[PDB]
Write a protein that binds this ligand. Structure first.
Ligand SMILES: Nc1nc2c(ncn2[C@@H]2O[C@H](COP(=O)(O)OP(=O)(O)OP(=O)(O)O)[C@@H](O)[C@H]2O)c(=O)[nH]1
Ligand SMILES: [Mg+2]
Lengths: 39, 55, 40, 484, 83, 24, 102, 32, 55, 55, 112, 154, 111, 133, 41, 42, 153, 157, 90
RNA sequence: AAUCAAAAUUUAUUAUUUAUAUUAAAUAUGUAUGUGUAGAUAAAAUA
């Protein structure tokens, strides 16, 4: 969506990796194969 | 034991107590949903005759 | 046709969920191998 | 990317199995190539070799105890030399003319190989062979359908004919009992013959054992045999089978009856030369052949159909079915079995469970999609202890060792011969996933293993290569981001 | 469960009502429940108690109410545009 | 081409015969 | 009925009767050893004894080539003819289909 | 023609009760 | 052989390598995650963040 | 190409397998000659249907 | 009990002999007819107490002769068949000089 | 073969448009592989057909996203380039099936259906026991009995 | 195949026992069972649509006999058929009246 | 004789084009297995070489089409409600496109392929000639 | 290369629906007549 | 006494609402049985 | 929550019924004496089933890890799959013996054909008034079948 | 479980011999038993029954019942002999209920024989003292049973 | 085992139907040989269930049983869509 | 607002149809394209 300021706060104590139940965002997709180039 | 016209007039008049169901389903009878008209035919046969051990 | 009665989890049919943890552990192993390559 | 295919040289062809290699552009990613560095005229010597090699083509003398649950191969010239009759019911489904001729050496194969090795000099080890068979004339091999029954029959025919032993091989018993047509025996009253199967047998057994049948002198054989102009009277057993099967129709129809009768008579008198007799599907020789007796109105004679008191033209009827003991071939076989004066003939046979399925109800078989169209219409249970005079051996399905070796041979030697995936190796899964999945689908049943190896083409729900290509493409993209 | 051993009743125990088939749960509500032009009190409240010919009566009442509301707004537009 | 001539003139004939309104 | 069971040919009960009568005239064993008790060929059908009858066939060509007529007119059942057809399935009293008689 | 159609013989016809054609072989007249 | 086959995987569309995933028509239908899905999967934490929190 | 021309030996509803152009007509020419050739009315049986005054 | 189970085949079920009397319109005549039929069935079933000739026979599914027994079907009259076959071969080799095909009907199978 | 009736020809695009029903039915595609595997022949256009339709059935229930607009026709033409590429491989297997089956039927002494050509035996369309008494497109009367394409002794 | 149905008397057996055919005759004496003479032994066809448990219309009694042309002309069908006395037809004959008030009383009596 | 569009001329290939629907049974596969077994044990290799030649001719990889090439050369959008016209157009358009007229299959002898062996001596049926020298 | 114009117009006259074309053209003539009548007052 | 469930009798009818459409109305009635088990005849 | 769902409560009751099944106690019960078709016909096929031992690869793969690797192979119900939680390790993890006569249910089709016809024909072959204990046994049985047009009526 | 065809194909437009489509009356269907019910052309009592669905369904039910009967009778390697109660073996000295009367009875749960008594088949060679007392010459030979404890090829000796 | 018969004979040895039954063990990263399963058919009984929709129902049944046995198995099995019910009738 | 038997309604005869199945010759040349009626419904870009 539009650009906001969420997540830009300094997290206290720097322990943002040990919280394994954190929000992981929407599920992104990846290509299974590189399509040939257009030009 | 009436025609389709008389059945529609007695449905629209309110004399009968009939329940409307979807016109492409099989109603509510589990034998009718299972096998159709022939299976309910055989079930009425099984209730009327074949459950009795004849003597 | 119109597959609106089909759930969203059935239309792409995203299988292969067992391999993701193996891929992540392999990625961590390759990062540590690259750190070993850069130091020597 | 990294091909290593232009650098690959072909190893020198020693046997037929080494010559079965495809071009390198086929199996380049199916069978991957490794590089080794040896120390000859320099410290690096880049030698590109294959990860997989073909199984070794071994003589039956060279097969040993350590080759149990391993895979070996036979040459195509040895296949033509040792099997002119053919193979079992489904043995040749895994050998096209491009494929190597592979065989799995199981534990029971090793037992029967040592048994045939002791048969070759039987008069010294007669008490040992009596203790092995428990005094019986031979072994009958039984198990569920699709096991290694007919494959083991071809293996012991290979073992017996590789050691210069006179070997009778009936590769399919359903050409005798469930044959095309039945004819009464010419010189045996009350007996019947399968003429086409007898002609093929008298051809192929003669051209298989010509080495020893030419030295076989005729002991009980009449010398006033009917003989056309220019033909020689037979003085050998090979000459007798050549008199039998080589003829013009319809003189061959009675010539095969006379030849089978006198061949079974000449076999029953030899007490010094060991004769191994291998029959695929002895359970068809132990019950009724599918022919029935003719109606007696056919032989009685009729003037007309209106007033003769007959119904052959009006209504069909099922007459009593002809048993196998009324065939002259099985008559000579049972004469050698039941008479105890023959401590010389070793009947290493098996059964077949090739029959059609029936599970309580049966509709009509769909003519397009029918795996059992050439199957037998029998439906009868069988017990090898009660219905045969031989010692029963129970073969079950594969254990995981034999199944792993067989599937490795199948997949890798089909991709090496240019009959597998080849360039499309990246679409199918790896060997561990294929082994797990085919072990699920088959239950390690060998015919089921072959059928699901062929049915691996239409697997819909394998997602290993998709996630692997996703991970490798993502790793390539982050590596290019690291390079920038 | 048994009432004599029930004390804290377990509710919504993941008994799947989508394995068995009860799809025909259609209901017919009267037209204009929150409409400002349709009155809350009326003789059409007597249409709420009728079971045998329910679907056709609800469709006919909805068609009649749509027709009279369309005619009312048409006459509203014609009179407010004619002056 | 005959179907094109029909699609040209036949709407005019069917308008004049069937669905032409009354005048004055 | 539909199969009109043919005339009884003399020695066709088993293979030894056919071998002794027609093929090999000097056959010593005339028939198979028959037990002293009664064998029931039709099972579990009780057939009138002393009557020539046929067993159910085992091959497909004997079932196919046997002159059996097909159904042509409307089929009838001895109890399901009070009910007219499966679409005019007549019920006298509206008892339940799981109604067990005491 | 279902079972025994081949058993019909030429003595079964009442050939004396009609008059046949000699060229075609068809029945040309019937006797009262 | 899997170690060797990992390096020669045809990641691009070529002669025998076909997409056929609807990547041209729909585009990126299969998901992929770089995080361990808790608590089904486990990746051990990096030593730098551990030592930073420890210090 | 094949089927672009019409061989006069082959019928018009069928399609010829020959690729040659010489001695063949275009299909507009075949359409004009089929519209040209079809002027005749089949002969009416007078004796098969009696007159209306007779009936 | 065995004779009662065989004489009442489907009227016995789960250790209970059941008779559904539907013959007459009234239930009193139906229970009279049911009592009569029960007494008739009991009097017919009680005949097993008279002797062993009224004990009902056990129906055993006796197998056909096995393959070990069918193997001896080839050796039936073995020496007679061999002595016949030698003269049949002599008849055949004398008949081969007349025609190309010698039918077993021309050797041992009598037709007329 | 026991199908000897006169048949109706179909265009190859209508066959492949059936997809998983008849063309890429998995039971049918397996027994086509057993024909090529028996002859010692690599099944490469059949494996090319199976790998395409395996992934084609995987996303066939997904709805395509709406295209808001492109200046050049390059991503639309690339999606059409691969689409007509997948049809031509399946056209090759459609010819490879009809090539080898008519070649095997000449080896197994198998008589085909009506108006069906076997290259070794019957260059014209072989017709046997048709409802029409003559040859439908050769305009020749049919003899009785049917034409034998092979020798007698089995 | 084609054979003659046999019978052994208990006086002929070395151990006497009651046969099954005279037990069938005793059952037919008790329950008045008709014994058809022309019933062929080859025609033992079960109603496999109802008898088989792996069919959709499974009812453990054979609902229809496997006989083409089991019609009204056959007297054994006439003997075992249900008579239409006091079936639903009797209710239809005495109930389906164009006015129900002529079924509860006479109109002259009520007036 | 009611001429129709089902002529299926036998000219442009070993298969007649617009071919009749053919059907394989497993009985055909068992007969083929027995035939290949007899040909293998008899030593006959000519028919195997003819089958390999047909496989080398008709089973090469088809070329990737150029950008702008489509299989509907004709616009199939104008046949909206005339369905029988669309079916007749499809059968005529595929009757025109014979297997001689693919042009994306490298069938001719001028092309080379490293996948399949081209000479019959390269196949392992004659290995004793090329053993070691 | 696209089709020429005259075969495209003749093919559109050949394969399209007649009844839908007739109904749309007749209702178009009716709409034009109502516009002319509304202009005439 | 206890009450035992019984399956309801349900019979549907297929008739025209006109060849236009088919109406599906079902007659139905519901059953509860009451089991009284007494250890004597009263 | 409760313990099991609707279909899970049904098949746990069928195992308690077969655990206390005795065929002489099915005297006059009717079709309620039929002893859970799945587990009953499995016992009748023990002449064909013949529960095999673990395979030679399995007992080698375990005993290498038990002895040569000092880390015992535990069952999939013993795997602590949750990272971040310790599970209370339920007692049915490795104590259930693998026997083919118990589970899974595989039977002969002829026994299943005979079971399904015998269960429907013996539906009303029940003796209600038996000389017994409580709610099963009685002297007279009254059933009052009430019928009305609505289910709440 | 069986994968053969049971139902008849329904009535529709006249099918043609195309791909995935067989004509409604073909010689391949039902062994050619549709030859009785076919019309070769592309009297009302002989034309109306070939088009009725219940008639053709009853006919294919009869044919499938004939196939089930011949496959059940081809399974039979035995025959039923009425043996008296005294000479029968110990497993048949009980009260055997009729078919579909009781629970399918196990043979001997005390002697660990859990199998149906109705499927039990006894050998002819073990009942020669019962079936043949009048011969006295032992018409069938004794069945040779293998020694299970003997060291043979099966036990690596 | 499905209704007393093993899975290779119920689905007529078809790999594309039995792979759907194998799939809930595959997505769970579980070995199939450590589990016994019996599947009872409660719908319409037919002589053969060798089709893809019956195999879909079999997969959903095996996946729900695996979820009921081990609870954490619901984390991959819901992500593969094996626990998800579609509503398509005829 | 002042009535009455169309097909309220049943049955039959050279005769009127549409359907029901029967139903064939014909290479000397030239040749023969519909609207619809139907069943369950699981491909898609010249405007
Ligand atoms: N090469 C090789 N193949 C084997 C071996 N064991 C089993 N097979 C495969 O297993 C399949 C079964 O072979 P058969 O022996 O004919 O099967 P069967 O047990 O006789 O089955 P039935 O004929 O029905 O009785 C064959 O097609 C072989 O491909 C073996 O030891 N060596
Ligand atoms: Mg075999």
């Amino acid at each position: 969506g539009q650009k906001s300021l969420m997540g830009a706060l300094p997290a206290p104590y720097g322990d943002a990796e040990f919280f394994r139940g954190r929000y992981r965002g929407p599920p992104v997709a990846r290509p299974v194969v590189s399509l040939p180039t257009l030009h | 034991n009436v025609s389709y016209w008389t059945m529609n007039k007695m449905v629209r008049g309110g004399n009968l107590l009939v329940h409307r169901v979807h016109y492409t389903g099989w109603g509510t009878d589990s034998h009718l949903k299972k096998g159709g008209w022939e299976h309910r035919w055989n079930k009425v046969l099984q209730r009327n005759v074949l459950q009795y051990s004849r003597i | 046709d119109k597959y609106r009665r089909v759930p969203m989890l059935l239309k792409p049919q995203q299988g292969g969920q067992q391999y993701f943890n193996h891929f992540l552990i392999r990625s961590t192993n390759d990062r540590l191998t690259q750190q070993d390559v850069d130091n020597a | 990317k990294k091909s290593l295919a232009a650098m690959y040289m072909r190893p020198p062809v020693t046997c037929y199995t080494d010559a079965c290699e495809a071009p390198v552009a086929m199996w380049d990613g199916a069978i991957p190539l490794k590089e080794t560095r040896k120390l000859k005229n320099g410290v690096p010597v880049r030698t590109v070799s294959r990860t997989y090699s073909h199984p070794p083509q071994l003589t039956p003398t060279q097969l040993s105890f350590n080759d149990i649950n391993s895979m070996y191969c036979v040459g195509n010239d040895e296949l033509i030399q040792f099997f002119p009759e053919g193979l079992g019911g489904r043995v040749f489904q895994t050998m096209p003319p491009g494929h190597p001729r592979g065989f799995l050496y199981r534990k029971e194969t090793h037992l029967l190989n040592l048994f045939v090795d002791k048969v070759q000099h039987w008069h010294t080890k007669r008490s040992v062979l009596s203790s092995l068979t428990n005094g019986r004339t031979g072994f009958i091999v039984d198990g569920p359908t699709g096991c290694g029954k007919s494959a083991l029959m071809c293996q012991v025919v290979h073992f017996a004919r590789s050691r210069n032993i006179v070997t009778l091989y009936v590769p399919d018993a359903k050409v005798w009992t469930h044959g095309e047509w039945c004819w009464p025996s010419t010189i045996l009253p009350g007996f019947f013959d399968a003429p086409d199967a007898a002609r093929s047998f008298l051809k192929y057994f003669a051209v298989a054992n010509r080495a020893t049948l030419t030295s076989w002198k005729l002991r009980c054989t009449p010398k006033d045999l009917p003989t056309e102009q220019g033909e020689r009277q037979p003085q050998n057993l090979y000459e007798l089978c050549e008199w039998g099967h080589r003829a013009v129709a319809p003189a061959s129809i009675d010539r095969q009856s006379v030849c089978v009768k006198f061949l079974m008579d000449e076999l029953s008198e030899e007490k010094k030369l060991p004769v191994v007799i291998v029959v695929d599907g002895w359970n068809l020789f132990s019950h009724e052949t599918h022919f029935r007796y003719p109606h007696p109105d056919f032989l009685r004679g009729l003037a007309s159909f209106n007033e003769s008191s007959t119904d052959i033209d009006l209504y069909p009827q099922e007459l009593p079915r002809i048993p196998a003991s009324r065939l002259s071939f099985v008559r000579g076989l049972n004469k050698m079995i039941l008479s105890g004066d023959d401590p010389n003939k070793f009947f290493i046979t098996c059964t077949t469970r090739d029959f059609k399925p029936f599970d309580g109800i049966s509709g009509f078989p769909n003519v397009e999609t029918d795996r059992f169209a050439n199957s037998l219409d029998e439906y009868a249970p069988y017990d090898p202890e009660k219905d045969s005079h031989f010692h029963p051996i129970q073969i079950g399905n594969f254990d995981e060792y034999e199944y792993r070796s067989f599937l490795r041979f199948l997949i890798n030697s089909g991709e090496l011969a240019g009959l597998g995936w080849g360039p499309l190796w990246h679409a199918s899964s790896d060997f561990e996933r294929k082994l797990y999945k085919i072990g699920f689908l088959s239950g390690r049943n060998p015919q089921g293993v072959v059928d699901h190896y062929h049915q691996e083409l239409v697997w819909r729900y394998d997602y290993q290569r998709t996630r692997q290509k996703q991970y490798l493409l993502k790793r390539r993209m982050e590596g290019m981001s690291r390079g920038a | 469960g048994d009432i004599y051993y029930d004390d804290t009743r377990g509710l919504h125990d993941r008994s799947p009502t989508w394995m068995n088939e009860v799809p025909e749960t259609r209901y017919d509500r009267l037209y204009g429940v929150n409409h400002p032009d349709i009155a809350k009190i009326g003789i059409r409240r007597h249409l709420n108690v009728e079971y045998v010919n329910r679907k056709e009566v609800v469709e006919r009442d909805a068609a009649l109410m749509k027709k009279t509301l369309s005619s009312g707004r048409r006459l509203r537009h014609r009179v407010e545009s004619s002056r | 081409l005959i179907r094109q001539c029909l699609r040209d003139i036949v709407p005019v004939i069917e308008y004049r015969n069937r669905e032409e309104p009354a005048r004055l | 009925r539909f199969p009109p069971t043919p005339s009884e040919t003399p020695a066709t009960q088993d293979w030894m009767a056919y071998t002794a009568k027609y093929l090999d005239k000097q056959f010593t064993i005339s028939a198979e050893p028959a037990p002293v008790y009664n064998v029931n060929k039709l099972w579990p059908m009780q057939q009138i004894p002393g009557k020539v009858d046929q067993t159910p066939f085992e091959e497909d060509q004997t079932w196919l080539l046997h002159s059996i007529p097909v159904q042509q007119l409307e089929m009838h059942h001895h109890e399901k003819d009070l009910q007219d057809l499966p679409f005019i399935n007549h019920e006298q009293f509206p008892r339940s289909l799981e109604w067990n008689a005491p | 023609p279902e079972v025994a159609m081949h058993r019909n013989t030429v003595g079964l016809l009442p050939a004396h009760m009609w008059e046949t054609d000699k060229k075609t072989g068809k029945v040309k007249s019937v006797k009262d | 052989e899997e170690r060797i086959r990992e390096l020669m995987m045809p990641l691009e569309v070529g002669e025998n390598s076909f997409a056929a995933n609807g990547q041209a028509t729909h585009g990126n239908l299969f998901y992929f995650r770089e995080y361990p899905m808790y608590p089904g999967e486990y990746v051990p934490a990096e030593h730098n963040t551990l030592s930073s929190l420890r210090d | 190409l094949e089927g672009a021309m019409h061989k006069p030996g082959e019928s018009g509803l069928q399609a010829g397998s020959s690729t040659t152009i010489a001695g063949k007509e275009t299909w507009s020419q075949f359409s004009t000659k089929m519209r040209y050739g079809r002027r005749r009315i089949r002969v009416i049986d007078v004796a098969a249907k009696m007159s209306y005054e007779y009936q | 009990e065995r004779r009662l189970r065989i004489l009442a085949q489907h009227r016995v079920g789960m250790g209970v002999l059941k008779l559904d009397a539907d013959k007459y319109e009234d239930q009193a005549d139906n229970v009279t007819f049911g009592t009569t039929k029960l007494s008739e069935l009991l009097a017919d079933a009680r005949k097993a107490q008279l002797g062993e000739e009224y004990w009902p026979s056990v129906e055993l599914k006796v197998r056909k002769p096995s393959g070990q027994s069918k193997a001896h079907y080839s050796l039936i009259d073995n020496e007679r068949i061999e002595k016949r076959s030698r003269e049949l071969y002599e008849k055949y080799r004398d008949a081969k000089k007349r025609s190309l095909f010698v039918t077993p009907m021309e050797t041992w199978l009598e037709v007329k | 073969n026991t199908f000897l009736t006169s048949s109706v020809a179909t265009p190859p695009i209508s066959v492949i448009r059936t997809g998983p029903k008849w063309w890429a039915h998995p039971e049918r595609m397996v027994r086509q592989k057993l024909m090529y595997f028996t002859l010692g022949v690599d099944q490469l256009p059949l494996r090319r057909t199976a790998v395409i339709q395996r992934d084609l059935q995987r996303f066939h229930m997904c709805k395509p996203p709406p295209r808001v607009g492109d200046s050049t026709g390059y991503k639309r033409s690339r999606a059409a380039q691969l689409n007509t590429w997948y049809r031509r491989i399946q056209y090759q297997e459609y010819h490879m099936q009809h090539l080898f089956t008519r070649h095997v039927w000449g080896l197994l002494r198998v008589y085909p259906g009506n108006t069906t050509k076997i290259q070794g035996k019957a260059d014209d369309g072989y017709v046997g026991y048709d409802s029409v008494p003559f040859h439908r497109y050769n305009r020749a009367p049919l003899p009785f009995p049917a034409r034998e394409l092979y020798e007698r002794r089995k | 195949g084609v054979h003659r149905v046999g019978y052994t008397h208990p006086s002929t057996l070395p151990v006497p026992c009651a046969q099954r055919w005279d037990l069938r005759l005793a059952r037919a004496r008790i329950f008045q069972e008709y014994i058809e003479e022309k019933a062929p032994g080859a025609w033992q066809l079960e109603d496999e649509r109802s008898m088989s448990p792996e069919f959709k219309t499974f009812t453990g009694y054979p609902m229809r006999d496997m006989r083409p042309g089991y019609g009204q002309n056959l007297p054994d069908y006439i003997m075992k058929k249900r008579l239409p006395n006091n079936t639903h037809y009797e209710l239809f004959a005495r109930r389906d009246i164009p006015n129900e008030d002529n079924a509860m009383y006479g109109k002259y009596l009520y007036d | 004789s009611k001429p129709s569009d089902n002529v299926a001329w036998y000219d442009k290939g070993p298969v007649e084009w617009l071919p009749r629907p053919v059907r394989l049974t497993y009985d055909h596969l068992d007969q083929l297995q027995q035939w290949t077994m007899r040909a293998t044990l008899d030593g006959r290799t000519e028919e195997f070489n003819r089958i390999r030649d047909l496989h080398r001719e008709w089973s090469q990889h088809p070329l990737m089409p150029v950008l702008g090439d489509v299989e509907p050369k004709f616009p199939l959008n104008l046949f909206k409600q005339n369905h029988r016209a669309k079916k007749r157009f499809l059968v005529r358009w595929h009757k025109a496109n014979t297997p001689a007229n693919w042009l994306w299959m490298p069938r001719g002898p001028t092309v080379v392929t490293p996948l399949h062996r081209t000479n019959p001596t390269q196949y392992p049926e004659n290995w004793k000639q090329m053993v070691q020298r | 290369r696209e089709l020429p114009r005259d075969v495209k117009q003749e093919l559109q006259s050949f394969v399209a629906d007649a009844a839908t074309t007739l109904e749309s053209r007749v209702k178009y003539l009716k709409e034009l007549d109502t516009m002319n009548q509304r202009m005439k007052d | 006494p206890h009450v035992e469930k019984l399956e309801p009798w349900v019979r549907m009818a297929e008739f025209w609402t006109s060849e236009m459409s088919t109406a599906h109305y079902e007659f139905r009635k519901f059953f509860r049985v009451i089991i009284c088990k007494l250890p004597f005849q009263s | 929550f409760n313990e099991f769902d609707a279909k899970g409560r049904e098949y746990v009751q069928y195992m308690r019924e077969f655990a206390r099944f005795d065929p002489r106690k099915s005297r006059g019960n009717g079709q309620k004496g039929f002893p859970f078709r799945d587990a009953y016909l499995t016992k009748m096929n023990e002449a064909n089933q013949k529960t095999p031992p673990p395979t030679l690869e399995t007992i080698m793969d375990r005993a290498v890890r038990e002895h040569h690797q000092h880390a015992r192979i535990l069952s999939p119900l013993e795997v602590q799959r949750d990272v971040g939680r310790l599970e209370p390790i339920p007692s049915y993890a490795g104590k259930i013996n693998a026997d083919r006569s118990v589970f899974p249910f595989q039977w002969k089709t002829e026994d299943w054909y005979e079971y399904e016809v015998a269960k429907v024909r013996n539906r009303r072959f029940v003796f209600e008034n038996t000389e017994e204990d409580g709610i099963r046994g009685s002297e007279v049985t009254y059933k009052i079948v009430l019928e009305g047009f609505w289910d709440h009526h | 479980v069986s994968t053969g065809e049971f139902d008849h194909p329904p009535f529709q437009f006249r099918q043609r011999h195309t791909f995935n489509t067989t004509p409604l009356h073909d010689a391949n269907r039902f062994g050619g038993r549709t030859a009785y019910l076919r019309e070769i052309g592309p009297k009302k009592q002989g034309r109306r029954f070939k088009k009725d669905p219940r008639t053709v369904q009853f006919n294919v039910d009869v044919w499938c019942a004939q196939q089930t009967l011949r496959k059940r009778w081809k399974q039979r390697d035995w025959e039923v002999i009425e043996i008296p109660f005294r000479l029968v073996p110990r497993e048949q000295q009980r009260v055997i209920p009729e078919l579909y009367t009781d629970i399918p009875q196990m043979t001997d749960p005390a002697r660990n024989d859990f199998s149906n008594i109705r499927n039990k088949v006894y050998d002819r060679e073990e009942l020669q003292g019962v079936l043949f007392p009048a011969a006295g010459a032992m018409l069938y030979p004794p069945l040779q049973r293998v020694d299970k404890q003997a060291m043979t090829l099966d036990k690596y000796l | 085992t499905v209704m007393g018969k093993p899975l290779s004979l119920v689905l007529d040895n078809k790999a594309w139907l039995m792979e759907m039954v194998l799939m809930p063990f595959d997505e769970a990263n579980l070995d199939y040989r450590d589990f016994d399963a019996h599947i009872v058919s409660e719908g319409h009984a037919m002589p053969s269930i060798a089709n893809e929709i019956a195999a879909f129902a079999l997969r959903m049944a095996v996946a729900n049983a695996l979820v009921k046995l081990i609870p954490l198995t619901r984390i991959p099995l819901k992500k593969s869509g094996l626990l998800s019910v579609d509503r398509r009738r005829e």
